[PDB]
Design a protein around this ligand. Structure first.
Ligand code: HEC
Ligand code: HEC
Ligand code: HEC
Ligand code: HEC
Ligand code: ZN
Ligand code: ZN
Ligand code: ZN
Ligand code: ZN
Lengths: 106, 106, 106, 106
């Protein structure tokens, strides 16, 4: 997918997590978010179109996806263990990761 | 890229790190490895073609890529900081992650 | 130090980071926070005195320190790469970890 | 506990994980290891006795404990999920972390 459609997938499943009823719903939403972030890994965002893929700025951009995926990784372990509510609370932390990359690069 | 091509990229660049003599070369190889792993994230390997994408096996498959990318992540900070020899030694750990996934799913 | 002492050290240095210039003020605050969190690792907080250190609740308690230390860990790499602004911005996510533990166990 | 006691705790419990036939012994051993590593956090090893707790060598020393605790963190999630064989294969990776610190600072 392109960067914009992966972002739609991130947003849709972030919402699913916040309103989920059970561990299966949380795990499915987290898995979909991680695959969307991994697929967006090599995207160049519009405001960085002039930057080398080997530059400090593009490493910072990808670093934002590493943070997001790492956060999803931990939440998914929690949901695998049945700590659904703790997994759901990880959405508050994820949201900041969204905001931070958006405020620098969107 | 397909799974086999991402693996060639992982293989080529792990050997680069093992033979490298400067920080820029290690950083460049680490970034290529991470992009290949992120691109391989949603691949289904031949031995899991019968498995549901939500199966435990496919989560465990993707989990091996998270481990690898996480190791690359820390090594890339060490390389960014000048600790070239430490970043280079992280290839010994990287290799164990290669072996573990291969033993299970290759 | 006891838990209350380490919490003050976290609180003071969390404020130092938000109100800092230069990698030095930030690095030094992060280093002290990591040492305080590590020293707190095995503390039994009042609301869990009836739980054994093998209980699920005590694992969930320590797990909140792992999240905190992992965030400090990444912030310190950023500060050591000269990314003082990005390091200072970790303070927002750190505070969320403070609050998530407090809401359950303080 | 002093550094020698925390190292004995790590050595004993790494062997427990290797020999283990059940999840409970793995989880218990990993918990003991994490506590030992957290307690060793602010130790000064003999070869750095003359240096500052703030020295770059001492940051680099502590960094080895973060690597170890992060690896224990993931293996404990796997043990908690009943993936006992996968948690035990994490011991191979832990050992390299033991060796990497010993080669530099023991
Ligand atoms: C960088 C590392 C990012 C992270 C992490 C997240 N997003 Fe993002 N997103 C990013 C950019 C550069 C853009 C701009 C796209 C463009 O073509 O200019 C976006 C865009 C979105 C959108 C589109 C909405 C709009 O502004 O019209 C959405 C809905 C969105 N992003 C959601 C989202 C969520 C929920 C995230 C975290 C879970 C998230 N994004 C992370 C870069 C990055
Ligand atoms: C799972 C999570 C894996 C990780 C981590 C790594 N590899 Fe891998 N590799 C994996 C599979 C399932 C396969 C088989 C793919 C197929 O279609 O048969 C492979 C294969 C390879 C190969 C051979 C590629 C080919 O042309 O057939 C190589 C050279 C290879 N892998 C290298 C490699 C390295 C160096 C890794 C770590 C840095 C690594 N792989 C990780 C699954 C997984
Ligand atoms: C659990 C994993 C915690 C994390 C992470 C943080 N804190 Fe905490 N804090 C915790 C407990 C159980 C308590 C109660 C201690 C008691 O004996 O009652 C506290 C308390 C505090 C306090 C008040 C200390 C006092 O004098 O009573 C402060 C100022 C405080 N905590 C700050 C703080 C900050 C800034 C944190 C993040 C950087 C943080 N705590 C994390 C448990 C946990
Ligand atoms: C640095 C960050 C280290 C990590 C990670 C591990 N160890 Fe270690 N170890 C370290 C030092 C500096 C020393 C010497 C301490 C001294 O005062 O001599 C050690 C020593 C040991 C020992 C011998 C203890 C003794 O009484 O002589 C053992 C058995 C040992 N270490 C085991 C061990 C294991 C199994 C580790 C990984 C799980 C490990 N150590 C990590 C520094 C560091
Ligand atoms: Zn966790
Ligand atoms: Zn690190
Ligand atoms: Zn980082
Ligand atoms: Zn994991």
């Amino acid at each position: 997918a392109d960067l914009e459609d992966n972002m739609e997938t991130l947003n849709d499943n972030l919402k699913v997590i916040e309103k989920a009823d059970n561990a299966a719903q949380v795990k499915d939403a987290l898995t979909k978010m991680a695959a969307a972030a991994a697929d967006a890994w090599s995207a160049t965002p519009p405001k960085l179109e002039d930057k080398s893929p080997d530059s400090p700025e593009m490493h910072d951009f990808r670093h934002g996806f590493w943070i997001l995926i790492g956060q999803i990784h931990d939440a998914l372990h929690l949901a695998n263990e049945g700590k659904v509510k703790d997994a759901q609370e990880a959405a508050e932390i994820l949201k900041i990761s969204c905001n931070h990359c958006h405020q620098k690069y969107r």
